[PDB]
Amino acid sequence: AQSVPYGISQIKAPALHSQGYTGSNVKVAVIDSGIDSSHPDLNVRGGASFVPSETNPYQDGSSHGTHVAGTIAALNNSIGVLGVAPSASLYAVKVLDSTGSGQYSWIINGIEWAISNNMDVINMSLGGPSGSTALKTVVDKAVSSGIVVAAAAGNEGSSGSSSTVGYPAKYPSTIAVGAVNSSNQRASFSSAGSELDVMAPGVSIQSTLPGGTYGAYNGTCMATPHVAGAAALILSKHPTWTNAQVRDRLESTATYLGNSFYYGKGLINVQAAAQS
Numbered sequence: 001a002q003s004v005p006y007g008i009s010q011i012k013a014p015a016l017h018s019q020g021y022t023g024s025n026v027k028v029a030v031i032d033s034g035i036d037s038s039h040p041d042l043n044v045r046g047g048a049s050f051v052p053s054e055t056n057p058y059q060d061g062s063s064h065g066t067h068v069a070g071t072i073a074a075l076n077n078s079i080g081v082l083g084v085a086p087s088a089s090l091y092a093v094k095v096l097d098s099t100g101s102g103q104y105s106w107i108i109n110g111i112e113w114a115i116s117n118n119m120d121v122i123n124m125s126l127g128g129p130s131g132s133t134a135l136k137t138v139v140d141k142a143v144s145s146g147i148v149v150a151a152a153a154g155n156e157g158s159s160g161s162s163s164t165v166g167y168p169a170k171y172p173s174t175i176a177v178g179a180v181n182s183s184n185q186r187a188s189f190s191s192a193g194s195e196l197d198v199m200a201p202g203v204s205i206q207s208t209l210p211g212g213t214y215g216a217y218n219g220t221c222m223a224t225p226h227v228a229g230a231a232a233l234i235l236s237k238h239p240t241w242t243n244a245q246v247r248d249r250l251e252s253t254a255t256y257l258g259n260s261f262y263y264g265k266g267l268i269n270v271q272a273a274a275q276s
Ligand SMILES: [Ca+2]
Pocket: 002, 041, 074, 075, 076, 077, 078, 079, 080, 081, 082
């Protein structure tokens, strides 16, 4: 039997599903450690690897990309879990190796691939503490091209009044996503700063794992795919909205939870964001 992870319900994705919107025809690039394309609860439509030592983007030695992918678009069926956008078109853009790490050069190549292949949404559940002009340039290029780019805010916790949001979440062109639990409480590891845009569930998030199994992880890495999936739901209902419109609706209709330094605009509400 199929289970719906709490986070899917917490962002009100089922309301869109009931309206008949599940992300159909929206192309979502999972820029991560690959996706186990053999998982029976995933449908991976394409992809590409930019890790020199791992030419196969459809094998995931880390599990990170496969878990992220399941939160975005685990299939609606008789097994496993259910994604935010279970009909979305998933693409495995491998820029991280089996250790779950990668160089910015690999990541940049993945974003370029997403642009060249006309992706609608980019999920980047990754980041580092140091900036990069080349990274900012390609991320801005993706946004100017019309792509919705969601990025994990970071797992560095809080440090007084200083921002701990990492890159590329720190860039204004990306949606920086923090993590809350099922009570809408901020996770203590969730990075904070003026760059934080929204929150999504990121504690004990059940999703798909390589080998056809399932398991729970914590991180802003897990919160980000809720926003990527939400953007895919919004585009399946409003195919003409620009990425700027999609972003504005996700942020402005969020459920305020408190100090924006720690919570941004609050918890995304895709039901309110997608209201005609
Ligand atoms: Ca399923």
